[PDB]
Design a protein around this ligand. Structure first.
Ligand code: 4BL
Length: 168
């Protein structure tokens, strides 16, 4: 469990790797994988779609049941559902979608949810279609998360920009 390999330590508690978060979950067997969720837990693309596809749609079926029963999440909020074949748990975290006019200050609230778990495999939040600057998202992660977070960044050019941003 939690067999993280080849990470670069950026701070006392934040680590980073140029890797596919699905292949990392399969290798590492983490206690927790973080999903970059939306408030209706509709896993239609990006990390959410990739994680759901790796679970053979189990995650979407679970999530549909959760939302029908319990209603939508709030921006900045989270829920813990099954990790299926990827992890013990999936922490579904909703970062703000600034492309849709949501407030970037809620990225802090989103990352604060990581402090309820000793160690996490995670993507950067509010990246991709959510429209935040990835360098800013890494900074909020570093400033907010105090538990151990292993970040997986798929794109090499972005990984390099993030690491360079951070150590040069
Ligand atoms: C699929 C999977 C991956 C990691 C873990 C870790 C646990 C545990 O601590 O009980 N269960 C898992 C299941």
């Amino acid at each position: 469990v939690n067999s993280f390999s080849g990470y670069l330590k950026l701070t006392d508690n934040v680590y980073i790797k140029n890797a596919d978060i699905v292949e990392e979950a399969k290798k590492v067997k983490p206690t927790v994988v973080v999903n970059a969720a939306n408030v209706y837990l509709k896993h239609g693309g990006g990390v959410a779609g990739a994680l759901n596809k790796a679970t053979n749609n189990a995650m979407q079926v679970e999530s549909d049941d959760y939302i029908a029963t319990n209603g939508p999440l709030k921006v900045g909020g989270s829920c813990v559902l099954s990790g299926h074949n990827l992890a013990k748990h999936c922490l579904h975290v909703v970062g703000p979608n600034v492309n849709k006019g949501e407030d970037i200050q809620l990225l802090k609230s989103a990352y604060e949810n990581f402090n309820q778990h000793e160690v996490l495999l995670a993507p950067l939040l509010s990246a991709g279609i959510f429209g935040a600057d990835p360098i800013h998202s890494l900074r909020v992660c570093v400033d907010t998360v105090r538990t151990n977070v292993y970040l997986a960044v798929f794109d090499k050019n972005l990984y390099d920009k993030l690491v360079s941003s951070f150590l040069e």
